[PDB]
Amino acid sequence: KLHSQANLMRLKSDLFNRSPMYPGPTKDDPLTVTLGFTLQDIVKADSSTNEVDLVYYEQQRWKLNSLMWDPNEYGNITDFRTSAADIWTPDITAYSSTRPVQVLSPQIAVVTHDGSVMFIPAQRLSFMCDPTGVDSEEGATCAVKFGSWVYSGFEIDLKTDTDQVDLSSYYASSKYEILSATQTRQVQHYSCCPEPYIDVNLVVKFRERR
Amino acid sequence: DDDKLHSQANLMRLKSDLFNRSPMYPGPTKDDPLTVTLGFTLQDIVKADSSTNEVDLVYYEQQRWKLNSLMWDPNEYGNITDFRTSAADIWTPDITAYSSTRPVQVLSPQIAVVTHDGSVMFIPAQRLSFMCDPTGVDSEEGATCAVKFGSWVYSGFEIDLKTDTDQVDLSSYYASSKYEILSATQTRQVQHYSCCPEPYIDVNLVVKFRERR
Amino acid sequence: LHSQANLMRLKSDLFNRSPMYPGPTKDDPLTVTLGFTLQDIVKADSSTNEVDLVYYEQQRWKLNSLMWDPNEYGNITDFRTSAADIWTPDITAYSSTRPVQVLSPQIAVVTHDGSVMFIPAQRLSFMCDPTGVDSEEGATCAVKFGSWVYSGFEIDLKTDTDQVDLSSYYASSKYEILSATQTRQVQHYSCCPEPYIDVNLVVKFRERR
Amino acid sequence: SQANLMRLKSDLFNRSPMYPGPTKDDPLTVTLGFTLQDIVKADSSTNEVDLVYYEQQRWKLNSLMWDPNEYGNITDFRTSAADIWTPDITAYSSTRPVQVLSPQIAVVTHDGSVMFIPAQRLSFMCDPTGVDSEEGATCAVKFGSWVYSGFEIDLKTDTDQVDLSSYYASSKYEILSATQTRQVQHYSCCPEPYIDVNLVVKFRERR
Amino acid sequence: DDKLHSQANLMRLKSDLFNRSPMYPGPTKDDPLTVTLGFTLQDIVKADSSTNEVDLVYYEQQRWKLNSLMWDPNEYGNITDFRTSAADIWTPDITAYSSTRPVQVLSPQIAVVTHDGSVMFIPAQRLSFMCDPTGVDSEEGATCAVKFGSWVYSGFEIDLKTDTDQVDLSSYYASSKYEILSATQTRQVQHYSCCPEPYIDVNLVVKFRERR
Ligand SMILES: C=CC1=C[C@@H]2[C@@H]3O[C@]4(C[C@H]5CCC[C@@]6(CC[C@@]7(O[C@@H](CC[C@@]7(C)O)C/C(C)=C/CCC7=NC[C@H](C)[C@@H](C)C[C@@]72CC1)O6)O5)C[C@@H](C)[C@@H](O)[C@H]3O4
Ligand SMILES: C=CC1=C[C@@H]2[C@@H]3O[C@]4(C[C@H]5CCC[C@@]6(CC[C@@]7(O[C@@H](CC[C@@]7(C)O)C/C(C)=C/CCC7=NC[C@H](C)[C@@H](C)C[C@@]72CC1)O6)O5)C[C@@H](C)[C@@H](O)[C@H]3O4
Ligand SMILES: C=CC1=C[C@@H]2[C@@H]3O[C@]4(C[C@H]5CCC[C@@]6(CC[C@@]7(O[C@@H](CC[C@@]7(C)O)C/C(C)=C/CCC7=NC[C@H](C)[C@@H](C)C[C@@]72CC1)O6)O5)C[C@@H](C)[C@@H](O)[C@H]3O4
Ligand SMILES: C=CC1=C[C@@H]2[C@@H]3O[C@]4(C[C@H]5CCC[C@@]6(CC[C@@]7(O[C@@H](CC[C@@]7(C)O)C/C(C)=C/CCC7=NC[C@H](C)[C@@H](C)C[C@@]72CC1)O6)O5)C[C@@H](C)[C@@H](O)[C@H]3O4
Ligand SMILES: C=CC1=C[C@@H]2[C@@H]3O[C@]4(C[C@H]5CCC[C@@]6(CC[C@@]7(O[C@@H](CC[C@@]7(C)O)C/C(C)=C/CCC7=NC[C@H](C)[C@@H](C)C[C@@]72CC1)O6)O5)C[C@@H](C)[C@@H](O)[C@H]3O4
Ligand SMILES: [Cl-]
Ligand SMILES: [Cl-]
Ligand SMILES: [Cl-]
Ligand SMILES: [Cl-]
């Protein structure tokens, strides 16, 4: 037990203190970031301001060579945990939020020996959404885009594993029931510039539960 | 006066020895799992909002664990058997409500108690908004709501989450609350995910309550 | 320039050259004296049974490690320090419903006898049923204050008086105060022989006419 | 010019010991004035009123003096308010923490004078009864040091007229008058005077 | 091999600019700084006629250039730009002059630095400011204005400019409660009777009404 602890501390020291740390992606060395949503609750829909409040888990995954190790050199440790503040994390942002996002989970990432990092902040988000039709069978439809704030598609290649939002943990007694929820990778161009810009469009269709 | 300076010097030396001169706990591993014992003392149901299905609780969340790296012999430190430390200066478990709707608001100073056997006691008072349908709260049968607590990033092979009792402590519940408590339980649950052989642990806090009359 | 240099030297001597107070122990208990000056009952919410008070919380304690001879420091008898740079007691409301909001600069007064005076102005929401507030008899509410992590053998919590100071109470508040008391209470827990101390603030109030 | 500015700041902040605050032997004059921008809200259910104002604070320190000839003719600079001593001037009857609206930056001039002007939103205790009438409502709030007497911080004003020249013309509330009056008080315990500036605002619903 | 090399060069560059060099201490009269400012208005969220406050969501584009942030890409593996936390560089103290609550930041506080020493910083923000929404429920709509400028620097220290006087409405939320009739951003030069120096602000004027 002392041995496994000593190995973990040595590993973390080797990656965080003895090695220079990831400065972020470049055009020459682009980073793939995979993004997916698990929608937990539509808490509130405000038709006086056209803001809707969601609670979701935002799953982020990327992989770095600088975070790789051989478990045989570190007492068979295959993974560890680190504060999200102590590693580089992608600047993925909602583009149409109306209040700062509120974080609901401890800011801790999972690092595996292949260099892959898994970071899953639970969040409450207020975003721009007209809930007209929410009190009808057809329901309301709203959308919000997520993407890097400062990196193009040539620097952060943003991807999804599926276009289906995970609804398996959606709160069964929410005020709003979900008719559908999709997450679609979109490529966008700006007329100034040849590089592509990537976002993931979260489209949610919902109505008042009855 | 002389003894008093001595006891102070010993406390400072102890804290220095544990926090500055020793490497500090990096968290649990599969080879070295940590038992964390969890219990709730429910103080008040402040608010039940049927327009959003959120309920607000005030409770004390008792957390206890034990580390070898925090052990000392009181005889080597002027018979000091315990001390206090800021929660920011030690490792603490990442226990989280799984269905909160707003960041938890902390109501107490973030200070932990460390004893010479290496056991740590940390008891944040908290206000929590969580997902809850209060339908039936204005009836005799009352409303029932539930919220799970557990580690965000550690399985049952890394943090073994336990309770001392399945009864929520109601002995400090606010007697003039808007809501009276019919029952409150805290149940350790073990769960498996089909991807993975390891067990995942949570503590399910189930509260049954109604408007006071 | 002489008086400034002496103040800086004094603060350097107490804060930088000396090891600082690690907190009280069973062998070296600390007396903390507590008193309230109630300024306003801002709000009483009968839909949630929360009441909001604005008060000044007077805290006083004394440390040997903060003593000095004024003759060795140009006749300086007192100074000011940020509350973050000294130890302060962890006195807490036991039945608050929101984090306390601080209204005053977090500065303490240190006198040459080693006594420290710290008086945060605060807004507090706490658990309170305001039923009867719209009547002659009024509503009664209570909230306890005490250390979060220290027993009576470590922090001996005291009051100078059991009367809450109402001499600054806001004369055009929505609520008038019928009475306000602050009572030291001693409590035992069945696990443990040590006493636990709190100060119970009891306020009786009604809607003004 | 940039090298000289950096050298000056280094000389004042890093190479010199910094101002520990005023003493009885070395009292500090702090001059205070208000520019009232808006009465945002008047809440008669809680008797709280919300103001937006600029709070002008000025003082002078020998330890912040320099000769511009020794620093490439630099006569002034800017510094974060966190990197210098600032006075603990406080509203005595606020009901919520003050919200700061401007960057916390002070202006330091070569004579050692410091100018610090935080824009603030303040909720304070105020009965707005009469606000819906011609006579209007009257409210008051005192400002002063929290921990220094008049023998340590000598609090002054330049004028007793609140500056209303930037008052928001389409506010919900119009200002009938606004004054800022230095008051001296004695407490029976103590011989030292205690100073505050009483901000009295008379206002009514527009128009 | 190249990938390790490009990473090493980025780290060396950042170390050279942030650790081995002193920070820009801010502008002076002898060395004034041009700051270019522009707005992209995303939403009028709320108009409160009981307090005369309006809430906007916008992106505030800020650009300036510093010699101390220049480098030759040939000396750093052809790196032409990088990203940095806004806390690690000097940023201009541009402020709304008639806000009623602290601005709420909606984007990560990261700036873009290019090898010519130019810095681009674009905080997304929610702002409450003083605004009478009377006429918002009519065809002519309501008109409100808010000035932006340096809090502590004159026109001889920060020369505040715009690239256009048209607010960018191309991302305005199509299902907002309020539709925008017009939105302009006008550089103004102000003289104060105390002082010969000019004071510069950018006046954001928005005309809007309830969507029908
Ligand atoms: C819903 C609309 C949005 C609009 C913004 C968008 O961004 C800008 C300028 C941007 C467009 C794309 C090309 C360019 C040119 C250089 C560069 O500068 C930005 C970062 C990346 C970089 C260095 O390549 C600089 C930067 C920090 C951008 C932050 C804002 C955005 N970031 C993500 C992504 C990069 C944009 C596409 C979309 C955008 C957020 C959503 O990108 O500039 C500015 C704002 C005001 C809007 O009008 C648009 O136009
Ligand atoms: C109410 C539903 C909840 C669902 C989440 C749950 O967690 C995930 C993936 C997770 C399931 C269990 C197996 C696995 C595989 C590796 C690992 O990764 C997470 C940390 C622990 C580790 C290393 O063993 C990585 C991590 C940071 C998990 C955060 C989320 C959760 N954490 C606590 C606990 C670990 C889960 C059971 C429950 C869960 C919070 C409540 O766990 O992955 C993701 C989210 C989106 C949900 O769909 C589920 O599925
Ligand atoms: C209105 C009811 C309240 C109940 C709490 C109370 O505290 C606990 C356990 C506590 C009772 C007294 C004996 C003991 C044993 C060791 C010790 O542990 C606490 C700190 C002091 C120490 C080391 O002596 C550990 C600690 C950090 C206590 C924080 C909580 C409280 N602190 C102040 C004071 C110390 C208690 C009396 C009262 C209490 C806040 C008010 O105290 O344990 C836990 C909570 C959940 C409640 O059920 C009770 O019981
Ligand atoms: C509207 C009523 C207010 C009442 C307070 C006032 O302050 C106290 C005690 C105070 C009265 C004046 C004399 C004395 C004696 C020593 C000293 O202690 C304070 C700081 C200055 C010092 C060292 O000279 C210690 C300190 C930190 C005081 C903070 C509170 C105030 N500060 C500013 C100014 C100093 C006071 C006049 C007014 C007061 C804020 C407004 O001042 O003590 C306590 C509180 C509870 C009230 O009842 C009164 O009485
Ligand atoms: C909508 C009205 C506003 C009014 C303010 C304005 O500023 C003051 C004094 C100011 C006017 C211009 C000349 C002068 C003289 C020296 C100097 O002092 C300020 C910083 C710049 C400096 C050193 O040149 C000192 C400082 C920190 C100013 C902060 C306030 C403002 N700053 C930006 C800009 C500098 C002003 C024009 C406008 C102003 C914010 C908007 O500027 O003083 C004070 C306040 C109370 C108002 O009455 C006016 O008058
Ligand atoms: Cl990293
Ligand atoms: Cl630890
Ligand atoms: Cl101390
Ligand atoms: Cl810089």
Tab-separated table of N, CA, C and O in Angstrom, chain D residues 1-2 5-6 9 37-41 52 54 72 74-76 78 99-103 105-107 117-119 121 168 170-173 206, chain E residues 22-31 49-53 68 93-102 130-132 144 151-154 157:
chain	number	residue	atom	x	y	z
D	1	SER	N	10.728	55.890	-22.041
D	1	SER	CA	9.595	56.274	-21.134
D	1	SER	C	8.989	55.066	-20.405
D	1	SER	O	8.639	55.133	-19.226
D	2	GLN	N	8.877	53.952	-21.108
D	2	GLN	CA	8.395	52.718	-20.505
D	2	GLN	C	9.353	52.128	-19.441
D	2	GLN	O	8.906	51.751	-18.347
D	5	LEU	N	9.008	54.306	-16.285
D	5	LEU	CA	7.778	53.978	-15.549
D	5	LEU	C	7.960	52.716	-14.710
D	5	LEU	O	7.619	52.699	-13.528
D	6	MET	N	8.527	51.678	-15.323
D	6	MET	CA	8.799	50.414	-14.623
D	6	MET	C	9.776	50.588	-13.461
D	6	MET	O	9.574	50.019	-12.385
D	9	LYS	N	7.882	52.506	-10.582
D	9	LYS	CA	6.988	51.587	-9.875
D	9	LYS	C	7.760	50.592	-9.017
D	9	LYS	O	7.392	50.341	-7.865
D	37	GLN	N	-25.269	58.845	-9.793
D	37	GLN	CA	-25.589	58.517	-11.180
D	37	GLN	C	-27.025	58.049	-11.367
D	37	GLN	O	-27.642	58.347	-12.387
D	38	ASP	N	-27.562	57.302	-10.410
D	38	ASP	CA	-28.890	56.734	-10.563
D	38	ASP	C	-29.424	56.195	-9.245
D	38	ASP	O	-28.691	55.581	-8.483
D	39	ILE	N	-30.710	56.451	-8.990
D	39	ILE	CA	-31.463	55.685	-8.028
D	39	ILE	C	-32.150	54.630	-8.872
D	39	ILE	O	-33.056	54.928	-9.648
D	40	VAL	N	-31.708	53.391	-8.713
D	40	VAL	CA	-32.147	52.302	-9.581
D	40	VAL	C	-33.480	51.761	-9.114
D	40	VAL	O	-34.365	51.497	-9.936
D	41	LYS	N	-33.615	51.604	-7.799
D	41	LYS	CA	-34.712	50.857	-7.216
D	41	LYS	C	-35.026	51.346	-5.808
D	41	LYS	O	-34.116	51.608	-5.027
D	52	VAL	N	-26.600	53.951	-7.597
D	52	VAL	CA	-25.365	53.839	-8.341
D	52	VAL	C	-24.698	55.210	-8.265
D	52	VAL	O	-25.302	56.228	-8.616
D	54	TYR	N	-20.466	57.285	-8.139
D	54	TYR	CA	-19.012	57.263	-8.138
D	54	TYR	C	-18.566	57.875	-6.826
D	54	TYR	O	-19.022	58.940	-6.436
D	72	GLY	N	12.415	60.461	-16.212
D	72	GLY	CA	12.044	60.809	-17.581
D	72	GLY	C	10.827	61.706	-17.722
D	72	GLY	O	10.067	61.560	-18.674
D	74	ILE	N	8.085	61.687	-15.960
D	74	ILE	CA	6.818	61.060	-15.578
D	74	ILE	C	6.253	61.806	-14.373
D	74	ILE	O	6.898	61.895	-13.329
D	75	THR	N	5.040	62.320	-14.537
D	75	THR	CA	4.352	63.088	-13.500
D	75	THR	C	3.234	62.303	-12.798
D	75	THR	O	2.733	62.732	-11.757
D	76	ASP	N	2.842	61.167	-13.368
D	76	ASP	CA	1.766	60.345	-12.814
D	76	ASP	C	1.814	58.922	-13.371
D	76	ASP	O	2.398	58.688	-14.425
D	78	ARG	N	-0.567	54.792	-13.040
D	78	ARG	CA	-1.721	54.039	-12.597
D	78	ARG	C	-1.263	52.793	-11.894
D	78	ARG	O	-0.273	52.184	-12.283
D	99	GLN	N	-21.423	46.502	-4.606
D	99	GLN	CA	-20.971	45.915	-5.856
D	99	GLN	C	-20.159	46.965	-6.600
D	99	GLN	O	-20.630	48.087	-6.838
D	100	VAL	N	-18.939	46.598	-6.968
D	100	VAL	CA	-18.035	47.495	-7.655
D	100	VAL	C	-18.274	47.379	-9.159
D	100	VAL	O	-18.340	46.278	-9.700
D	101	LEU	N	-18.360	48.520	-9.832
D	101	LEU	CA	-18.691	48.576	-11.269
D	101	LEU	C	-17.540	49.015	-12.174
D	101	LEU	O	-17.683	48.986	-13.383
D	102	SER	N	-16.432	49.468	-11.585
D	102	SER	CA	-15.322	50.023	-12.327
D	102	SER	C	-14.053	49.250	-12.004
D	102	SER	O	-13.987	48.597	-10.979
D	103	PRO	N	-13.040	49.324	-12.879
D	103	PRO	CA	-11.801	48.603	-12.617
D	103	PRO	C	-11.125	49.234	-11.417
D	103	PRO	O	-11.117	50.466	-11.297
D	105	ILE	N	-8.558	50.653	-10.099
D	105	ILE	CA	-7.291	51.288	-10.466
D	105	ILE	C	-7.251	52.697	-9.902
D	105	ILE	O	-8.208	53.461	-10.036
D	106	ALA	N	-6.126	53.035	-9.284
D	106	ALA	CA	-5.910	54.359	-8.711
D	106	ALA	C	-4.883	55.142	-9.521
D	106	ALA	O	-4.045	54.559	-10.215
D	107	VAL	N	-4.971	56.465	-9.411
D	107	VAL	CA	-4.068	57.399	-10.090
D	107	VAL	C	-3.125	57.985	-9.052
D	107	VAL	O	-3.578	58.555	-8.059
D	117	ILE	N	-11.438	56.297	-7.522
D	117	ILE	CA	-12.849	56.599	-7.788
D	117	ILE	C	-13.626	55.342	-8.183
D	117	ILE	O	-13.953	55.150	-9.351
D	118	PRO	N	-13.943	54.482	-7.196
D	118	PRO	CA	-14.767	53.321	-7.526
D	118	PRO	C	-16.210	53.712	-7.839
D	118	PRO	O	-16.841	54.430	-7.051
D	119	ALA	N	-16.712	53.239	-8.977
D	119	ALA	CA	-18.141	53.243	-9.247
D	119	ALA	C	-18.763	52.067	-8.492
D	119	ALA	O	-18.248	50.947	-8.535
D	121	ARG	N	-22.576	50.117	-6.848
D	121	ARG	CA	-23.988	49.960	-6.545
D	121	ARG	C	-24.137	49.549	-5.072
D	121	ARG	O	-23.542	48.563	-4.632
D	168	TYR	N	-28.597	60.221	-14.207
D	168	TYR	CA	-29.304	59.650	-15.356
D	168	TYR	C	-30.645	60.357	-15.588
D	168	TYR	O	-31.564	60.254	-14.768
D	170	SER	N	-33.189	59.791	-17.455
D	170	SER	CA	-34.418	58.990	-17.599
D	170	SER	C	-34.573	57.959	-16.491
D	170	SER	O	-35.266	56.954	-16.658
D	171	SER	N	-33.950	58.226	-15.341
D	171	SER	CA	-34.176	57.424	-14.138
D	171	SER	C	-35.659	57.368	-13.792
D	171	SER	O	-36.433	58.251	-14.174
D	172	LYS	N	-36.054	56.315	-13.085
D	172	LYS	CA	-37.408	56.242	-12.521
D	172	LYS	C	-37.627	57.308	-11.457
D	172	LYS	O	-38.760	57.683	-11.184
D	173	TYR	N	-36.540	57.764	-10.844
D	173	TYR	CA	-36.595	58.727	-9.767
D	173	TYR	C	-35.818	59.968	-10.136
D	173	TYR	O	-34.696	59.894	-10.635
D	206	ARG	N	-40.515	60.078	-11.052
D	206	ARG	CA	-40.543	60.975	-12.157
D	206	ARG	C	-41.954	60.879	-12.800
D	206	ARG	O	-42.337	59.805	-13.078
E	22	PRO	N	9.931	41.806	-18.547
E	22	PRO	CA	8.934	42.450	-17.670
E	22	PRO	C	7.626	42.670	-18.433
E	22	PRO	O	7.680	42.821	-19.667
E	23	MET	N	6.485	42.667	-17.735
E	23	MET	CA	5.215	43.074	-18.397
E	23	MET	C	5.155	44.520	-18.741
E	23	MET	O	5.660	45.353	-18.007
E	24	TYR	N	4.510	44.777	-19.874
E	24	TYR	CA	3.975	46.089	-20.199
E	24	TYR	C	3.299	46.722	-18.972
E	24	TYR	O	2.361	46.148	-18.434
E	25	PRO	N	3.806	47.886	-18.510
E	25	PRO	CA	3.273	48.561	-17.333
E	25	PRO	C	2.059	49.434	-17.626
E	25	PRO	O	1.529	50.051	-16.714
E	26	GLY	N	1.635	49.485	-18.886
E	26	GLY	CA	0.535	50.328	-19.308
E	26	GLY	C	1.068	51.485	-20.141
E	26	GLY	O	2.278	51.705	-20.197
E	27	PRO	N	0.172	52.214	-20.803
E	27	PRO	CA	0.576	53.307	-21.672
E	27	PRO	C	0.952	54.566	-20.900
E	27	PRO	O	0.568	54.717	-19.742
E	28	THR	N	1.683	55.444	-21.570
E	28	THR	CA	2.070	56.761	-21.050
E	28	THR	C	1.762	57.833	-22.095
E	28	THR	O	1.399	57.522	-23.235
E	29	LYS	N	1.887	59.092	-21.695
E	29	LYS	CA	1.717	60.225	-22.621
E	29	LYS	C	2.766	60.208	-23.733
E	29	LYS	O	2.458	60.523	-24.874
E	30	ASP	N	3.984	59.801	-23.388
E	30	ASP	CA	5.069	59.655	-24.363
E	30	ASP	C	4.914	58.440	-25.274
E	30	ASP	O	5.477	58.409	-26.360
E	31	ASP	N	4.172	57.436	-24.812
E	31	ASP	CA	3.988	56.183	-25.533
E	31	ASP	C	2.510	55.738	-25.502
E	31	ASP	O	2.159	54.742	-24.851
E	49	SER	N	-38.916	48.130	-16.909
E	49	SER	CA	-39.458	49.483	-16.831
E	49	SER	C	-39.764	49.922	-15.395
E	49	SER	O	-40.037	51.102	-15.174
E	50	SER	N	-39.714	49.002	-14.430
E	50	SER	CA	-39.859	49.369	-13.014
E	50	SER	C	-38.568	49.948	-12.415
E	50	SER	O	-38.632	50.683	-11.442
E	51	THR	N	-37.414	49.615	-12.991
E	51	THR	CA	-36.116	50.172	-12.544
E	51	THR	C	-35.327	50.924	-13.628
E	51	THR	O	-34.304	51.542	-13.332
E	52	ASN	N	-35.818	50.895	-14.868
E	52	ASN	CA	-35.105	51.454	-16.021
E	52	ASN	C	-33.686	50.911	-16.150
E	52	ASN	O	-32.692	51.650	-16.167
E	53	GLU	N	-33.640	49.583	-16.205
E	53	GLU	CA	-32.433	48.822	-16.490
E	53	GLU	C	-32.725	47.913	-17.655
E	53	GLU	O	-33.807	47.306	-17.719
E	68	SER	N	6.605	44.950	-27.114
E	68	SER	CA	7.079	43.928	-26.178
E	68	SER	C	6.473	42.527	-26.399
E	68	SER	O	6.968	41.558	-25.824
E	93	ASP	N	-8.456	48.922	-19.494
E	93	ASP	CA	-9.500	49.091	-18.481
E	93	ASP	C	-10.794	49.677	-19.071
E	93	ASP	O	-11.374	50.610	-18.516
E	94	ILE	N	-11.264	49.098	-20.172
E	94	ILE	CA	-12.443	49.603	-20.861
E	94	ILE	C	-13.660	49.229	-20.027
E	94	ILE	O	-13.787	48.099	-19.621
E	95	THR	N	-14.533	50.197	-19.783
E	95	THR	CA	-15.633	50.040	-18.854
E	95	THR	C	-16.869	50.709	-19.396
E	95	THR	O	-16.777	51.801	-19.971
E	96	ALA	N	-18.019	50.084	-19.148
E	96	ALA	CA	-19.297	50.736	-19.332
E	96	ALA	C	-19.428	51.836	-18.279
E	96	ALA	O	-19.188	51.598	-17.110
E	97	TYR	N	-19.783	53.045	-18.694
E	97	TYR	CA	-19.889	54.162	-17.770
E	97	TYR	C	-21.225	54.233	-17.023
E	97	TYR	O	-21.306	54.952	-16.018
E	98	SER	N	-22.252	53.520	-17.483
E	98	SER	CA	-23.574	53.598	-16.866
E	98	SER	C	-24.162	52.223	-16.592
E	98	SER	O	-25.374	52.015	-16.653
E	99	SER	N	-23.299	51.278	-16.251
E	99	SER	CA	-23.748	49.981	-15.773
E	99	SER	C	-24.396	50.143	-14.394
E	99	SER	O	-24.095	51.083	-13.654
E	100	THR	N	-25.309	49.233	-14.085
E	100	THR	CA	-25.976	49.191	-12.776
E	100	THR	C	-25.656	47.947	-11.949
E	100	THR	O	-26.115	47.850	-10.818
E	101	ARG	N	-24.947	46.979	-12.538
E	101	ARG	CA	-24.497	45.774	-11.843
E	101	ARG	C	-23.152	45.364	-12.428
E	101	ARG	O	-22.847	45.741	-13.553
E	102	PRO	N	-22.342	44.587	-11.674
E	102	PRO	CA	-21.081	44.150	-12.263
E	102	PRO	C	-21.331	43.328	-13.524
E	102	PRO	O	-22.286	42.549	-13.566
E	130	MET	N	-28.283	51.529	-17.521
E	130	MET	CA	-29.378	52.473	-17.322
E	130	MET	C	-30.042	52.746	-18.638
E	130	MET	O	-29.407	53.219	-19.576
E	131	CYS	N	-31.334	52.466	-18.695
E	131	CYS	CA	-32.082	52.551	-19.928
E	131	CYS	C	-33.583	52.615	-19.632
E	131	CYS	O	-34.107	51.750	-18.954
E	132	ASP	N	-34.238	53.657	-20.141
E	132	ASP	CA	-35.682	53.807	-20.067
E	132	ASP	C	-36.273	53.124	-21.293
E	132	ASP	O	-36.132	53.628	-22.395
E	144	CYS	N	-31.871	53.509	-26.335
E	144	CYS	CA	-30.973	53.609	-25.202
E	144	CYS	C	-29.541	53.672	-25.639
E	144	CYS	O	-29.185	53.264	-26.738
E	151	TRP	N	-11.303	53.832	-17.778
E	151	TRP	CA	-11.689	54.443	-16.509
E	151	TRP	C	-10.656	55.470	-16.056
E	151	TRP	O	-11.018	56.490	-15.463
E	152	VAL	N	-9.374	55.206	-16.333
E	152	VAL	CA	-8.292	56.014	-15.785
E	152	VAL	C	-7.314	56.652	-16.791
E	152	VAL	O	-6.354	57.297	-16.368
E	153	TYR	N	-7.517	56.451	-18.089
E	153	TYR	CA	-6.605	56.990	-19.091
E	153	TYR	C	-7.338	57.967	-20.016
E	153	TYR	O	-8.410	57.637	-20.544
E	154	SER	N	-6.699	59.109	-20.260
E	154	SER	CA	-7.163	60.080	-21.242
E	154	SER	C	-6.859	59.625	-22.662
E	154	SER	O	-6.192	58.598	-22.886
E	157	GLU	N	-3.294	58.884	-23.695
E	157	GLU	CA	-2.689	57.667	-23.156
E	157	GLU	C	-3.276	56.422	-23.824
E	157	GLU	O	-2.536	55.533	-24.243
